[PDB]
Design a protein around this motif. Sequence first.
Motif, short mmCIF file in Angstrom:
data_model
loop_
_atom_site.label_atom_id
_atom_site.label_comp_id
_atom_site.label_asym_id
_atom_site.label_seq_id
_atom_site.Cartn_x
_atom_site.Cartn_y
_atom_site.Cartn_z
N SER A 130 -6.93 5.17 -4.64
CA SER A 130 -6.13 4.18 -4.99
C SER A 130 -6.45 3.00 -4.43
CB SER A 130 -4.64 4.46 -4.95
OG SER A 130 -4.26 5.68 -5.84
N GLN A 131 -7.70 2.59 -4.05
CA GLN A 131 -7.86 1.61 -3.06
C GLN A 131 -8.56 0.32 -3.75
OE1 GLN A 131 -10.69 3.64 0.29
NE2 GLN A 131 -9.17 1.80 1.07
N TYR A 132 -8.34 -0.78 -3.05
CA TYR A 132 -8.71 -2.38 -3.61
C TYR A 132 -10.25 -2.49 -3.30
CZ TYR A 132 -3.93 -2.51 -4.48
OH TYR A 132 -2.81 -2.32 -4.80
N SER A 133 -11.08 -3.08 -4.27
CA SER A 133 -12.33 -3.47 -3.83
C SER A 133 -12.02 -4.86 -3.25
CB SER A 133 -13.10 -3.59 -5.08
OG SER A 133 -13.01 -4.71 -5.97
N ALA A 134 -13.12 -5.19 -2.38
CA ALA A 134 -13.11 -6.47 -1.78
C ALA A 134 -13.19 -7.84 -2.92
CB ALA A 134 -14.38 -6.96 -1.09
N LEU A 135 -13.74 -7.72 -4.11
CA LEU A 135 -13.92 -8.70 -5.09
C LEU A 135 -12.55 -8.66 -5.91
CD1 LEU A 135 -16.00 -8.64 -8.37
CD2 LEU A 135 -15.41 -10.56 -7.16
N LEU A 136 -12.25 -7.68 -6.00
CA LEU A 136 -10.63 -7.93 -6.67
C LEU A 136 -9.77 -8.88 -5.69
CD1 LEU A 136 -8.14 -5.10 -7.47
CD2 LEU A 136 -8.51 -7.11 -8.84
N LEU A 137 -9.80 -8.13 -4.60
CA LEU A 137 -8.72 -8.96 -3.39
C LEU A 137 -9.14 -10.43 -3.58
CD1 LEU A 137 -8.66 -6.25 -0.61
CD2 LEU A 137 -6.82 -6.77 -2.50
N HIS A 138 -10.43 -10.62 -3.49
CA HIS A 138 -10.95 -12.23 -3.45
C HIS A 138 -10.25 -12.75 -4.70
CE1 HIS A 138 -13.03 -15.82 -2.36
NE2 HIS A 138 -13.80 -15.69 -3.71
N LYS A 139 -10.52 -12.32 -6.07
CA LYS A 139 -10.13 -12.43 -7.35
C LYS A 139 -8.63 -12.85 -6.94
CE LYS A 139 -11.80 -10.42 -10.93
NZ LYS A 139 -11.85 -11.63 -11.89
N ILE A 140 -7.84 -11.79 -6.64
CA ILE A 140 -6.32 -12.10 -6.45
C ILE A 140 -6.02 -13.06 -5.60
CG2 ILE A 140 -4.12 -11.13 -5.82
CD1 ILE A 140 -5.49 -8.23 -6.67
N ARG A 141 -6.88 -13.29 -4.57
CA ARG A 141 -6.47 -14.50 -3.42
C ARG A 141 -6.63 -15.87 -4.11
NH1 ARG A 141 -8.92 -16.18 1.92
NH2 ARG A 141 -6.89 -15.96 3.02
#
Length: 195
Positions: A130-141
């Motif tokens: 259930s983790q988050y990738s860095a790109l996803l997190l970047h995209k969300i930011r």
Amino acid sequence: RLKNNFNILYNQIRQYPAYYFKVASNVPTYSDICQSFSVMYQGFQIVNHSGDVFIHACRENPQSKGDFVGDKFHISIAREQVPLAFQILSGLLFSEDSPIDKWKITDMNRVSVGIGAQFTLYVKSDQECSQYSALLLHKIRQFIMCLESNLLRSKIAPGEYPASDVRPEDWKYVSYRNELRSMLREEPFYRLMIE
């Protein structure tokens, strides 16, 4: 273990260049989504069941193929500026580049969550455990920044954030909540959003 895996994520986000979201052009108006019993637009299915006060939007091919694991944002607008704010935000919310596969919005005709928190944005995981990738997190930011920016520059009035939520002082419309957590500013996910 955790500190390092956090920092692994943190420094990866800062390595990525600024992200741009191709704005959807065929977007339904506010009144169109208010009547959409069950209707597809731009790969999002729109439902407005009388079972609650919300109009749900749900991308039938999620880009984050795992669980919703608690993490979400609200957008809070002044009550009378809600449909306007939707029109301003619809291009982003329906964008094929948006990192948000599921959102909802208060139906201003059913309501008396009408004073603030009228948009909810659900974050799902895209990795194992259930983790988050860095790109996803970047995209969300990047996406939040971009929502913020579009509302501010059309001089939209902020509404009332829920007491439950946290936000930094530079967010005027967006706020954050994790459902699992009943020290909300300590949440790994949240730290990655603001720092």
